[PDB]
């Protein structure tokens, strides 16, 4: 959420799973407009990166 | 006298209408123009 709304960096959101060996990105704080954040170009930019 | 989409955006009907918005973004591409006529039966 913080990344999509613009108040976070592309690298500040990724966290390593302790026992899993993979990275994850959490949902952040529950936004008031979840469907319209996911429509932002930032989501596709993050996926492309 | 306010819109349901603005008075309570978390409403179930507004969620259905958001799904409708996403389905119309796909149905209305390859159309003559950006005019959408809605008619009751």
TrEMBL record, chain B:
Name this polypeptide is given: Putative transmembrane protein Wzc
UniProt superkingdom: Bacteria
Localization per record: Cell inner membrane
Species lineage: Bacteria, Pseudomonadati, Pseudomonadota, Gammaproteobacteria, Enterobacterales
Similarity annotation: Belongs to the etk/wzc family.
């Amino acid at each position: 959420s913080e990344f999509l709304s613009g108040q976070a960096a592309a690298e500040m959101i990724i966290d390593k799973v302790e026992g899993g060996g993979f990275d994850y990105i959490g949902r952040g704080q529950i936004p008031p407009n979840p469907a319209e954040l996911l429509m932002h170009p930032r989501f596709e930019q993050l996926l492309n990166w | 006298d306010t819109l349901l989409a603005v008075g309570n955006p978390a409403d179930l009907a507004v969620e259905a209408i958001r799904g409708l918005r996403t389905s119309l973004h796909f149905a209305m591409m390859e159309a003559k123009n950006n005019v959408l006529m809605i008619s009751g039966a």
